[PDB]
Design a protein around this ligand. Structure first.
Ligand SMILES: Nc1ncnc2c1ncn2[C@@H]1O[C@H](COP(=O)(O)OP(=O)(O)OP(=O)(O)O)[C@@H](O)[C@H]1O
Ligand SMILES: Nc1ncnc2c1ncn2[C@@H]1O[C@H](COP(=O)(O)OP(=O)(O)OP(=O)(O)O)[C@@H](O)[C@H]1O
Ligand SMILES: Nc1ncnc2c1ncn2[C@@H]1O[C@H](COP(=O)(O)O)[C@@H](O)[C@H]1O
Lengths: 100, 51, 289
């Protein structure tokens, strides 16, 4: 099996952060802008009413390529009785979908 | 410009990365997501198979 | 009893390895991809996640795969072919609420829950995060007890023979023969709710063992005999692990833990099977002392 860290693009860093903000808004998650390249995002579970947080961080991996990093925030989220881990995976799959 | 990937944050894994999302190339409309989390002094790597 | 006291003084959390992997399936997953992923990942069970209800709703095990293989086989004989594309949710609908345990719950609770619910897979779920942490088993628990319980004080029943204790099953032993088709074995598995079948010969002597674990090897062809299907034996195989009635509980627990199989075939001087002694029997015995 070949596992990939987050996702990759060859758009401009600014362009990239633009689309993930749009993708985020579409989902109706709340987000905060720490760096121009670092986003904390928050989301309230419609079923469980809990909150889950995660970081989106953009790195440069190439001269032409950047990497968007997803990291769960271990802050006492989430479930539920859901599952902080599984709900993390779902927030991501949704964002990765809206992108693509 | 955006920070450079820290090692040892691996870009690819073949079979400090705690809480980081890894994923397989999509196939058959099914998504496979992975990550390692910590409960006290225990670690588990969860794979979620999701259409 | 020392076994009982130990069990009550330890949390399930103590049984979890420093590092493990867990495979979870979204219930909308197609059954056929689910079972291939068990094989690929080297795991015997997966927590099932209902995205709609946002929680774990059950488990996928080999027993399920077997039920499904058995249905598939019969339905095919009558030209019904619907089970392949079935997502997991729909196959569950076709027919067992999730039983789990907190990492802070006692090991005694873990044991009772397995016995009372007649399952083999107890997910340890943290109520805080809601995360499944580990899947707890009879094998894991019995190994832990053996390792962490001091040899003395030793209860006297530990020195008693199987004969005396009467632990295990000694009547209506489901068995197959060397020349028995795998689909026949499935029928027996599905009917007898039993984890493995001794392969015997004309005179009733055990020569092999056909486990449920030996069946998912096929999600990676149900006409071949049992003997043939046990040629793709992936692990090194010294032969069948057995015991005699005169042997003591202690000797049998030791064999079981060191062997790391789910049961021993009870046998006589001639290798004729007289019964089965499973981890379930032993743990039940240690918990009722
Ligand atoms: N923790 C659980 N909660 C709810 N249902 C379960 C749980 N574990 C297993 N089951 C269900 O109970 C049935 C029997 O499961 P069991 O645990 O005996 O399977 P198995 O461990 O794969 O089989 P074996 O251990 O005998 O090889 C299966 O249909 C399974 O879906
Ligand atoms: N009494 C026995 N003698 C010889 N071989 C055995 C015996 N019991 C099991 N085996 C073999 O060892 C392998 C492991 O089977 P077993 O079901 O005991 O372990 P498991 O199912 O992986 O773990 P668990 O005990 O949690 O179900 C199987 O392939 C089986 O053929
Ligand atoms: N082939 C078999 N025939 C009859 N009983 C069995 C057989 N295998 C296991 N058992 C019994 O079924 C119960 C559950 O065991 P197991 O399925 O091995 O966890 C135990 O009491 C076993 O003694």
């Amino acid at each position: 099996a070949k596992w990939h860290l987050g996702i990759r693009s060859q758009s401009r860093p600014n362009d990239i952060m633009a689309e993930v903000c749009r993708a985020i808004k579409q989902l109706d998650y709340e987000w905060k802008v720490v760096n121009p390249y670092y986003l904390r995002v928050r989301r309230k579970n419609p079923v469980t009413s809990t909150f889950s947080k995660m970081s989106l961080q953009l790195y440069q991996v190439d001269s032409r390529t950047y990497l968007l990093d997803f990291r769960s925030i271990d802050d006492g989220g989430g479930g539920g009785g859901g599952s902080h881990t599984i709900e993390f995976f779902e927030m991501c799959a949704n964002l990765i979908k809206i992108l693509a | 410009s955006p920070p450079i990937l820290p090692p040892h944050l691996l870009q690819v894994i073949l079979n400090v990365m705690l809480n980081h999302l890894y994923a397989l190339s999509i196939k058959d409309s099914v998504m496979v997501l992975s990550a390692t989390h910590r409960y006290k002094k225990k670690y588990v790597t969860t794979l979620l198979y999701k259409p | 009893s020392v076994y009982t006291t130990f069990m009550k003084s330890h949390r399930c959390y103590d049984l979890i390895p420093t590092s493990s992997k867990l495979v979870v399936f979204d219930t909308s997953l197609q059954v056929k991809k689910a079972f291939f992923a068990l094989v690929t990942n080297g795991v015997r069970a997966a927590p099932l996640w209902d995205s709609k209800k946002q929680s774990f709703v059950g488990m996928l095990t080999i027993t399920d795969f077997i039920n499904i293989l058995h249905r598939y086989y019969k339905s095919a004989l009558v030209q019904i072919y619907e089970l392949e594309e079935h997502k997991i949710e729909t196959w569950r609908e076709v027919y067992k609420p999730l039983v789990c345990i907190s990492p802070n719950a006692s090991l005694f609770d873990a044991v009772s829950s397995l016995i009372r619910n007649k399952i083999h897979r107890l997910p340890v779920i943290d109520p805080e995060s809601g995360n499944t942490l580990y899947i707890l088993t009879h094998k894991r628990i019995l190994k832990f007890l053996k390792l962490f319980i001091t040899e003395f004080p030793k209860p006297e029943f530990m020195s008693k023979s199987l004969e005396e204790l009467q632990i295990g099953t000694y009547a209506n032993i489901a068995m197959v023969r060397t020349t028995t088709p795998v689909y026949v074995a499935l029928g027996i598995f599905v009917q007898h709710r039993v984890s493995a079948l001794p392969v015997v010969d004309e005179k009733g002597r055990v020569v092999d063992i056909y486990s449920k674990f030996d069946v998912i090897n096929l999600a990676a062809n149900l006409d071949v005999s049992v003997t043939k299907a046990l040629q793709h034996r992936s692990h090194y195989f010294e032969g069948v692990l057995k015991c005699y009635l005169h042997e003591t509980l202690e000797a049998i627990i030791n064999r079981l833990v060191e062997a790391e199989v789910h049961r021993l075939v009870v046998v006589d001087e001639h290798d004729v099977v007289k019964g089965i002694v499973s981890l379930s029997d032993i743990l039940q015995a240690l918990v009722l002392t």
